[PDB]
């Protein structure tokens, strides 16, 4: 049902909220959730992991699959498949990992990928142990992403801290 609220609009068609990405697609009943996943979809840590153990593993267990007969993703790129409980859709997406040296142009090409969507649900990408400095991902998002976009930051000093850069 895409029932988005309590966000601030930071464009046309971005918005941001302080807010647990589980509970607000529980809460949305969204299309499509973004995953912040790696290149063999192993949903181990961070975002992957919190929306792996709230689908109780069928995202793991469908990821699995998917890598047996397809292959790992390329960094910059992206896969469709089902939301589970969370989301008719999810979309794992791969940004690059800065601390592994990975070229950090390629968040451009993760982000492109939120173009195919009418509306989405995300996080940012590249945050974490991926160390993609988090200003730099929201104006990534911002310069590249046409299609409607929510974005949920489960940390209230990042936020506020991205909100207040953001409004310079
Ligand atoms: C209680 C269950 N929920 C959570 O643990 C949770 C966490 C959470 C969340 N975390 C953000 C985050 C953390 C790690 C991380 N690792 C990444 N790696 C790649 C491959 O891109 S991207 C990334 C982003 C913080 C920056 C705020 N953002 C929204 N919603 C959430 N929910």
């Given at each position: 049902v895409n029932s988005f609220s309590g966000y601030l609009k930071l464009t046309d068609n971005v918005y941001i909220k302080n807010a647990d990405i589980v509970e607000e697609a529980k809460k949305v009943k969204p299309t499509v959730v973004v995953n912040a996943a790696n290149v063999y979809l192993k949903?181990?840590?961070?975002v992957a992991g919190a929306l792996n153990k709230a689908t109780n593993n069928a995202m793991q267990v469908e990821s699995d699959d998917y890598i047996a007969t397809n292959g790992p993703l390329k960094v910059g790129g992206s896969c469709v498949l089902s939301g589970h409980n969370?989301?008719?859709?999810c979309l794992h997406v791969v940004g690059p990992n800065v601390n592994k040296?990975?070229?950090?142009?390629l968040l451009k090409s993760a982000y492109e990928?939120?173009?195919?969507?009418?509306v989405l649900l995300a996080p940012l990408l590249s945050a974490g142990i991926f160390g993609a400095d988090p200003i730099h991902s929201l104006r990534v998002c911002v310069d590249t992403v046409r299609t409607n976009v929510y974005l949920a930051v489960f940390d209230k000093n990042l936020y506020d801290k991205l909100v207040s850069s953001f409004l310079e």
């Open positions: 949903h181990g840590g961070g969370l989301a008719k859709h040296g990975e070229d950090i142009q990928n939120f173009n195919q969507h009418e």
